[PDB]
Design a protein around this nucleic acid. Structure first.
Ligand SMILES: [Mg+2]
Ligand SMILES: [Mg+2]
Ligand SMILES: [Mg+2]
Ligand SMILES: [Mg+2]
Ligand SMILES: [Mg+2]
Ligand SMILES: [Mg+2]
Ligand SMILES: [Mg+2]
Ligand SMILES: [Mg+2]
Ligand SMILES: [Mg+2]
Lengths: 96, 63
RNA sequence: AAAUCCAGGUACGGGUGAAGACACCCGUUAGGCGCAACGGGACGGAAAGACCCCGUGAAGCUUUACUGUAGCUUAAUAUUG
RNA sequence: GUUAAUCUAGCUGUAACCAGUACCGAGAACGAACACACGUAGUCAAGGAGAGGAUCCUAAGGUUAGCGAGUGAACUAUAGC
RNA sequence: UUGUGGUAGACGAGCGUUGUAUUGGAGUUGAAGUCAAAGCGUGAGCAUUGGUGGAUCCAAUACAAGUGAGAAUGCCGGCAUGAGUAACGCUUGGGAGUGAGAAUCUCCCAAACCGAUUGACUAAGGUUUCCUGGACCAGGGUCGUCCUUCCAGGGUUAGUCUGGACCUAAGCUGAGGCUGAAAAGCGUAGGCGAUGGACAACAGGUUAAUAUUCCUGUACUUACAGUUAGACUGAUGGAGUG
RNA sequence: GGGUAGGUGGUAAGAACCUCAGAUCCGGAGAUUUCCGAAUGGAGCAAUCCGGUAGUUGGAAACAGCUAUCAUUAAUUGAUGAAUAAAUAGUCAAUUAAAGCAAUACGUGGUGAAGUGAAACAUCUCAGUAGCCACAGGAAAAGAAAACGAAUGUGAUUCCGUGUGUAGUGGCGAGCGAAAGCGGAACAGGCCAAACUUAUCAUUAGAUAGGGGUUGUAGGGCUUGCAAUGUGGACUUGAAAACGAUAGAAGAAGCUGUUGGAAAGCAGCGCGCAAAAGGGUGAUAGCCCCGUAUUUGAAAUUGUUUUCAUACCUAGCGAGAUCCCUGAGUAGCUCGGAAAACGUUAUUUUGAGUGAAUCUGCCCAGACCAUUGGGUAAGCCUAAAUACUAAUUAGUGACCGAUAGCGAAACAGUACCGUGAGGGAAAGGUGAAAAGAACCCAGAGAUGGGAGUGAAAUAGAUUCUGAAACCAUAUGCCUACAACG
């Protein structure tokens, strides 16, 4: 599928911001960009706090069902018997 | 075309190797004569035919 | 704008010299720098001299130079009795 | 063609397709490498004197020749003497 | 001990460059490249420090070559000099206005040339150069608020005009066909081909830009049916005219 | 069918919508496919003009919409029909093929130079090269012996090495240069004409369609018997299966600290492997992501092979006897020329002329004759090895890295030159990301100077670095009686 879909929580692994948990709004799959709300607000000087895209490498999904709300990889291989392709964390078993 | 109509034997191209062996390109033209012929539908025709095939026509009695 | 241009702070006489010198030699003269001029020189500039010669170089032209040839003409043979 | 077609004259009605149509037409739109003194078919062609479309000046109309301002030396062109 | 000048030219030993291989190793605590400096070598050449710069690179041994530049009236790019020199390619004076800025633009008034023309209409060409508003990187041999330049918007209106839908000349093409190694060449019927023949529209007005085209007024033509009357029509061909 | 969650092509933000009832996207198959163009209704200055015919709709009718058809040539079929009575030419109609393009390449075939070399030059070479032209093809051409050629011999063709720079050939100068033999890649040989026989053509057949038969230690036909039911393919239709090609699915493993703008480096402690190929991620990542190794999967279209059935073709050993057949303007011979290594010569071809024989035959073994020996022309067909790659896919490089490399890294065969054929360029890089520099002062304005973002604005849109020639500014020293590579 896609490791990053519009809507799900996501945090930053590298850059000037660390642990900048926020929500994703737009994804440009062609150029590998994401627009996470609440992050990298650059003060545009129009002749405003529109966001700045963050490359999908930096982003990482946010576990929310485990007591330790840590960060992990994703499997797609889980195709539940009564479901289509789903996301499940490698160092856990938590769908989405 | 200066070739005959029964067969298509055309001119032969060679050299005019004179004395002292100077070369000069030259053509040999088939002997064409207007002798008649008779087909097996009537339609007697006059065709430009070469002499070598004229002899063959003369012996196979195609006139 | 231009052609030009080995670097230049680029005198004159006699001599010498690849044989006619801004530079060499020996004398002489001359503060530094422009502007308008004129043309003696720098064998000035523009053109790898047109003449001449050389190349086992080119092209054009000529002819009773050579070798061939398109054409024109003559004979045998086929077309053909 | 007559058991009427076709034409002529008139009345009523209908239709009249396709491309060109601006502007320049040359001392600045064309051919000259240019906003280059050159070249390019035909048409209209006023008045005075005059044979006249010559020649001098003007009309209808139209242009400011897309670097200026001075001085009035040599020197050059052009005119005048 | 004997020697060590040297072009053409023979021979020997060597430096450097680019890359590959294995071996060591330096680098955002700043790599190569680039300039600067008062170093070291017998030479080709080689280090050291600092500024700049912002990611690759140095040494050792072999190997392979687009391997080493001052000259070719060398090629390409840049820059001088000549020089702020010659040239700026037929013409004026002013008032008022605009504008930050005017000889140069707009208006006015003269002035000076043209006038068998620098005037007016069009063909050929060219292809938006036309009209209005705006702009002043570049082009304009100066300047410029302005240009035939640039930008946004716009304009070309036909039964009768120029040409097709009619005609043919020179000529071009050319079914069959003739000739020619091949392609092609020649050519008949047909078909094209105006610079020519035949065909019906005049005057005036209007818009910033069109006009025998639009509008106003008055016209003509060529077809088509339907209708009234008269009449027998009379061609793909013959003749006359053209 | 795949495939998810965004998307409406790039300079591109905004405006207005479609979409998670499964769009866009990707792959297969389809339909639409204006006009010119072989261009083909007729023209024509290419991309425009003018039509005919047959339907249908509108209209009272011209006329207009809307459909299809309308070139030439060759073959075949039918109809019609001349001077001329019949017949043929011709004309009309119907059906089926191509005409063109390009892969600047490869193949064949026709025609065919010169420069140059010879230190000049004509014989000769360059060269059967370039060019022009016709013709296809996926490869073509060639080809199954009237052979090689010296032997108790090989046994279609093609291609590579060697023979060898040999034997020869050459104004015996320059130069040219095989055929055998040998080692190899690949390997298949089939079928007509004619004798004889059948059926039919006013059967004057000398013709049409069958059977039969294919050749050399000669064969086949003609008369007579035995054995055969089978391999074999240069090959027709079906069915089944396998392996692929065209979208894709899953696809392991990491944190901490320091410099730091950002660490993925450096350092500490781990970890995974059929994956340490590669690309991106703020600086050099095996563990951040996308992939890769591996394991997989196709509704539809397509390729190669295999299996079973299925046609057509294809099969063997003897006996008799003057029987018949065994490719005619042909092989030769002569005149002029050429291919072959050979500058004309056996062999091979031919523009002109002449011209045989028939198994006791014909041709051949470098003029020629005899002996010996080899092979049977004058008819057709043929996969494989071979040559070439503009093209599709994956990938490589001790190949180039913007004066290079394709002429061309970008809207290049463009702009531009030329009437036309044709000739024919130059130039790329901000930063990690526009956070493209709001605001203030001067100014008419571009712009500049502060501010602001940012690691740096000596990164500022003149945009990576930024030498030299070159032009200006400045500390320090010298120079206005001086002859200066
Ligand atoms: Mg001189
Ligand atoms: Mg003029
Ligand atoms: Mg005129
Ligand atoms: Mg007058
Ligand atoms: Mg006059
Ligand atoms: Mg001067
Ligand atoms: Mg002067
Ligand atoms: Mg002057
Ligand atoms: Mg012999």
């Amino acid at each position: 599928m896609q490791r990053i879909k519009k809507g799900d929580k996501v945090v930053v692994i590298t850059g000037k911001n660390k642990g900048g948990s926020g929500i994703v709004l737009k994804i440009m799959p062609a150029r590998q960009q994401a627009i996470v709300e609440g992050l990298n607000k650059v003060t545009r000087h129009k002749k405003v706090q529109q966001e700045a895209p963050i490359f999908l490498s930096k982003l990482a999904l946010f576990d929310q069902k485990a007591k330790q709300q840590t960060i992990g990889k994703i499997k797609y291989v889980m195709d539940p018997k009564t479901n289509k392709k789903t996301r499940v964390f490698k160092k856990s078993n938590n769908t989405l | 075309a200066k070739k005959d109509q029964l067969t298509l034997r055309g001119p032969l191209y060679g050299n005019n190797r004179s004395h002292s062996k100077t070369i000069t390109r030259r053509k040999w033209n088939v002997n064409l004569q207007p002798c008649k012929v008779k087909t097996a539908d009537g339609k007697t025709t006059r065709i430009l035919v070469s002499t070598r095939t004229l002899r063959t026509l003369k012996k196979h009695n195609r006139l």
